[PDB]
C-alpha cells in the first residue's frame, strides 16, 4: 500500500504542478490586485511545498511586491517590483508565520506582520528647498510638477492633497484639524495608483520626510536641495522660518530621501528625476505584463 499510494500521490502532485504552472502563465498579463511592502526577507527552501518546485519568489526586507492572484491559503501569485523579476509564488502571511516558527524551533530561537499593504505605485512627494506655502518653494516645486506633467504625459497623475496626511501630541493636532478626511485622502491616493500610473502629490503639510515615515503610503521622497544658504536668502528677497528648515532638511540623514536633487543646474536636476522615474516605470511595467 505504501508503494501504491506513493504512485497515486506522485501522479496527483505532477498534475497539480502542471495546472499551477499554467495558472502562473495566465497571471503574467493580469492586473495588479494590490501591493505590499515587506518587513521580512524570504529565502525559499525545497521543503516549503511551493505549488511549483523552484518558482517561489525571493525577496528582502523593505522590498515591494505586486500581487496578482490568490492561489490558496498559503500562496499568492505575484512579482518583486524590480526590473528582470517575473511573476512567481509568494507565501501568504499564514505560510510565512509557519515557516518562521519552524526556523525558530530548528535554531532553538508575537512578531510584527510580515507585509504592509501599500499603494501599487509609490506616490511622489517633493520636499524642499524650504517651507511650502511660500513663494520660493512653491515656485520651484510647481516648476518640477510642470516638467513631470510634460515628460510623463499620459503616464502620471498629479493631484493636490490639502489634508494633513502626516496624521495618518498628535491627539491635539488631530483636534486642530478630521481623521475621516485624512483616511479618505489616503484611500484616494491608493485608488489613483491602482492602474499603475505614476502618482505625484502636492502635499501642503509635508515639509520633512519624518512627517510621513510611519505611514503605509510608502512615498518616494524627492529632495529639492539648495545647498547655499546665501542663494536662498537671495531668492526670498519671513526669512527666519524659511532658512531654519532648509538647515533642518540639510541635517536630515541621507537615507531618509529617495532622490536628492542637488544638481547645480535646474535642467540637470529635472533629467536626474526623469531618469529615476523612467527606471521606476520599467520596474513596475515589465515587458511580459503588456501582452
Amino acid at each position, epitope marked *: 500500500s505504501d508503494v501504491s499510494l506513493e504512485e497515486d500521490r506522485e501522479a496527483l502532485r505532477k498534475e497539480a504542478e502542471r495546472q499551477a504552472l499554467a495558472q502562473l502563465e495566465k497571471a503574467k498579463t493580469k492586473p495588479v490586485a494590490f501591493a505590499v511592502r515587506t518587513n521580512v526577507g524570504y529565502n525559499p527552501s525545497p521543503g516549503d511545498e511551493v505549488p511549483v518546485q523552484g518558482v517561489a519568489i525571493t525577496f528582502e526586507p523593505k522590498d515591494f511586491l505586486h500581487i496578482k492572484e490568490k492561489y490558496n491559503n498559503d500562496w*499568492w501569485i505575484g512579482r518583486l517590483v524590480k526590473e528582470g523579476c517575473e511573476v512567481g509564488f509568494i507565501p501568504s502571511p499564514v505560510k510565512l*508565520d509557519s515557516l518562521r516558527l519552524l526556523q525558530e524551533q530548528t535554531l532553538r530561537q*508575537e512578531h510584527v506582520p510580515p507585509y*504592509d*499593504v501599500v499603494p501599487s505605485m509609490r506616490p511622489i512627494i517633493l520636499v524642499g528647498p524650504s517651507l511650502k506655502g511660500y513663494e520660493v518653494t512653491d515656485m520651484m516645486q510647481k516648476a518640477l510638477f510642470d516638467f513631470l506633467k510634460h515628460r510623463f504625459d499620459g503616464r502620471i497623475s498629479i493631484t493636490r492633497v490639502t489634508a494633513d496626511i502626516s496624521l495618518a501630541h498628535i491627539i491635539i493636532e488631530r483636534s486642530n484639524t478630521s481623521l475621516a478626511e485624512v*483616511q479618505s485622502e489616503i484611500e484616494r491616493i491608493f485608488e489613483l495608483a491602482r492602474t499603475l500610473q505614476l502618482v505625484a502629490l502636492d502635499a501642503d503639510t509635508i515639509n520633512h520626510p519624518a512627517q510621513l515615515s510611519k505611514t503605509s503610503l510608502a512615498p518616494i521622497i524627492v529632495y529639492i536641495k539648495i545647498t547655499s544658504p546665501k542663494v536662498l536668502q537671495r531668492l526670498i528677497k519671513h526669512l527666519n522660518v524659511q532658512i531654519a528648515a532648509s538647515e533642518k532638511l540639510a541635517q536630515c540623514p541621507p537615507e531618509m530621501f529617495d532622490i536628492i536633487l542637488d544638481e547645480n543646474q535646474l535642467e540637470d536636476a529635472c533629467e536626474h528625476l526623469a531618469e529615476y522615474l523612467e527606471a521606476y516605470w520599467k520596474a513596475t511595467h515589465p515587458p511580459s505584463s503588456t501582452p
Partner: nanobody
Amino acid sequence: QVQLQESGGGLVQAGGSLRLSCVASGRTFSSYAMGWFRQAPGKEREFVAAIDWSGGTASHADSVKGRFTISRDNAKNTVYLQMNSLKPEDTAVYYCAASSYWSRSVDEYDYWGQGTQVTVSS
C-alpha cells in the same frame, strides 16, 4: 480553523454612534486581514470595510466613507467597526470575516462570523 463572534448589534437611532466588535479564536489572528460585510434581508452581503494585518492600511466602502472606521488590536484578537452618523440605510446584519488575502470579495475570505443585527430607527 478560526472562529469569529460578532457583538454589539441592537436597536439604535439615526445620528447616533455604535461600536461593533468581533473576537477571533486561535493564535494566528495577526496572519489574517479582517473584513466587515453587511446584509440587507434576502440579499447577498456586501463589502463595508477591511483592515490589513498590522492595522496600518484600511479600505472603506463609498457609502460609509468618513462615517465608519475599522480598526483592530492583535493583542486581544479583536476587530472593531466604529459607526458614527448612523443613517436608516445602515440597517443590516453585519458580519466579520478573516482572509489570508487582501480583498473586498466575499469569495476570497476564509472564515466568517454568524453576524450581528443593527436596526437604525429613523
